Amino acid sequence: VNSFSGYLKLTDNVYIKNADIVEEAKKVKPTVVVNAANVYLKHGGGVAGALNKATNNAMQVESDDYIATNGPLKVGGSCVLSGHNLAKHCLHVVGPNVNKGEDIQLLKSAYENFNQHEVLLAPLLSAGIFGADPIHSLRVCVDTVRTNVYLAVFDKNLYDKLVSSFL
Numbered sequence: 196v197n198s199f200s201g202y203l204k205l206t207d208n209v210y211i212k213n214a215d216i217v218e219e220a221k222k223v224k225p226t227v228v229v230n231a232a233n234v235y236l237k238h239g240g241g242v243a244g245a246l247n248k249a250t251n252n253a254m255q256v257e258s259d260d261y262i263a264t265n266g267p268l269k270v271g272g273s274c275v276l277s278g279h280n281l282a283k284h285c286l287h288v289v290g291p292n293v294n295k296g297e298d299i300q301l302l303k304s305a306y307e308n309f310n311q312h313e314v315l316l317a318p319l320l321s322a323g324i325f326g327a328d329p330i331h332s333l334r335v336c337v338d339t340v341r342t343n344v345y346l347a348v349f350d351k352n353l354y355d356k357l358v359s360s361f362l
């Protein structure tokens with residue numbers, strides 16, 4: 196039993212809710228919140244910008260130190276950093292950005308990172324400003340993630356389409 200409330204169940208292990216992931220995180224304080232990161236951990240916009248803003252830029256400060264030490268992530272890769280005031284940990288996951296020409300086959304590799312965590316709050320990877328088809332992102336999620344994932348979809352119109360078209 197967990198504290199995630201109001202989700203629709205899509206599969207044994209995948210759940211979905213129309214919610215602002217920022218407000219959802221501040222409410223549940225999950226062990227892991229997933230960020231839709233880029234390889235430089237520059238949290239300028241989209242979900243990343245919103246999460247970082249909610250941490251008063253502390254996420255960005257921590258991220259800049261991470262990159263200075265370790266260099267950029269791989270597309271499809273991830274790192275675990277602090278969740279600040281939002282969660283215990285933030286799993287920064289880099290889905291392919293279609294508006295950068297990056298291989299969509301990398302989306303499966305990106306979702307595989309979720310399997311290292313028993314329960315996560317997450318956005319749809321490569322969706323939004325990353326330019327991929329969110330219906331496709333949801334299919335890859337369900338077919339790749341085996342751990343318990345609670346998906347927050349900010350756009351109500353998109354949420355209804357995802358639910359109504361889900362096979």
Ligand SMILES: Cc1cc(Br)ccc1[C@@H](CC(=O)O)NC(=O)c1ncnc2[nH]ccc12
Pocket residue numbers: 214215216217218231241242245246318319320321322323324325347348349350353
């Ligand atoms: C823009 C974008 C970029 C990538 Br990459 C991946 C998903 C998205 C969209 C897709 C959607 O509408 O769900 N989501 C969010 O921006 C989002 N999701 C949940 N809580 C949030 N709070 C503030 C923003 C926010």
